[PDB]
Amino acid sequence: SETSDLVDISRFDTHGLGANYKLRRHKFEHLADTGCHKARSDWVKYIGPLTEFGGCNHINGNFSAVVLPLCRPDRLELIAYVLEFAFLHDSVLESENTSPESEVQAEAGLRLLYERCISRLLQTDEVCAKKIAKTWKDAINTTTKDKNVDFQSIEDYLEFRMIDTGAPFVEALMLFGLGMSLSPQEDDALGHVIRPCFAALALTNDYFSFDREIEEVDTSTLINSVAIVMRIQSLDIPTAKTIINETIQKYEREFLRRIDEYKQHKPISNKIEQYMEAMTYQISGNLVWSLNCPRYNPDYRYG
Ligand SMILES: [Mg+2]
Ligand SMILES: [Mg+2]
Ligand SMILES: [Mg+2]
Ligand code: NA
């Protein structure tokens, strides 16, 4: 509206993904860029050198700007700040060559910036902040404990991967950006609705980050459904990617069904109507951002 512009998703090559999802780009995207800069500067200040890109993407839109385009402008910078730290902390958790000395050495710095993000969120919106802290902690713990599990189906993998990829974490941030809280009743019913959305987000990331994650497998755990399909079905990269592409399309359709099924079995409030809409923008934003984000695409990298 006055906070985001509608963007024609057909102007992008999405490999058949994102059909019937609308795409929006936050008008205050510079605040997301500012949040990511400050987070990266604090990382070098308290942790160590930067070794990768996070949410930044000036071509197709900052991660926060397209994934969360309904965010209130006064909350976009902090959300992007949090996500940028999460982007960088994510690769630390996946690392397999980190010495016990460096892990001890970086523990206090990681703690400081984590506590800095939680404190700022609590000071702005306490109810929303508590959900962010809960999901953030659950994602880190789940990743730490379960990242080495050998899954033998995409279904089993996704129960872990939806948490590892940060889908509830990002949902909690999106609610904070809306200044929105759900009742425990609404929490219960909407959990079933957004499960295929979480899976679409997780598998879409696998699709577009597989090349980069294969490049890092010498030093990082490979958590990717493309690899799983390759092993269990004895397929090469593009054939496995096609199967994941098809699986993404299935989850995308299932999400649209559950949104409309919710609307049928339950006159919804305009709050829940906004919630449903905001969730669909995660799908289109995550998809378009992953197309040429420097994080996964080296010929878009700089500096
Ligand atoms: Mg990860
Ligand atoms: Mg990762
Ligand atoms: Mg990935
Ligand atoms: Na990895």
SS3 readout for 165-187: CCHHHHHHHHHHHHCCCCCHHHH
Give me the half-sphere count of Cα atoms (radius 13 Å) on the Cβ side of residue 85.
Answer: 27
**Domains located in the chain, CATH noted:** 4-300 (1.10.600.10)
> What CA–CA distance (Å, rounded) separates 87 from 276?
25
Nearest to 66 by CA among 22, 35, 131: 22
Please, which residues have CB within 8 angstroms of residue 192's CB and are 6 or more apart in sequence?
A: 258
CA 300 to ligand 3 centroid distance, Å: 17
Tokens of 275: 């919630």
Resolution in A: 2.2
CA 254 to ligand 2 centroid distance, Å: 25
Q: Please state the separation of Cα 301 from the chain's center in Å.
A: 20
Quickly tell me which residue has 């205050």 as its tokens: 28
In the chain, the amino acid numbered 266 is K
Contact in structure between 76 and 88 (CB atoms under 8 Å): no
DSSP assignment of 230-269 equals HHHHT--HHHHHHHHHHHHHHHHHHHHHHHHHHHHH----
Q: Which ligand is nearest to the CA of 166?
A: 1
CA 87 to ligand 2 centroid distance, Å: 7
Straight-line distance from the first to the last Cα atom of the chain, in angstroms, rounded to the nearest whole number: 34
> What CA–CA distance (Å, rounded) separates 201 from 288?
12
Please, which residues have CB within 8 angstroms of residue 12's CB and are 6 or more apart in sequence?
A: 60, 288, 291
CA 74 to ligand 4 centroid distance, Å: 33
Tokens of 223: 């958590």
Beta bridge partners of 4: 26
| 3-state SS assignment for residue 52 | coil
CA 70 to ligand 2 centroid distance, Å: 25
> What CA–CA distance (Å, rounded) separates 187 from 191?
6
Q: Which ligand is nearest to the CA of 54?
A: 2
Which residues participate in the annotated binding site for Mg(2+)? 90, 94, 164, 205, 209, 213
| 3-state SS assignment for residue 1 | coil
CA 22 to ligand 3 centroid distance, Å: 23
CA 83 to ligand 3 centroid distance, Å: 15
Which residues participate in the annotated binding site? 90, 94, 164, 205, 209, 213
> What CA–CA distance (Å, rounded) separates 69 from 291?
18
Phi, psi dihedrals of residue 49, rounded to the nearest 5°: -70, 150
Quickly tell me which residue has 């799983």 as its tokens: 228
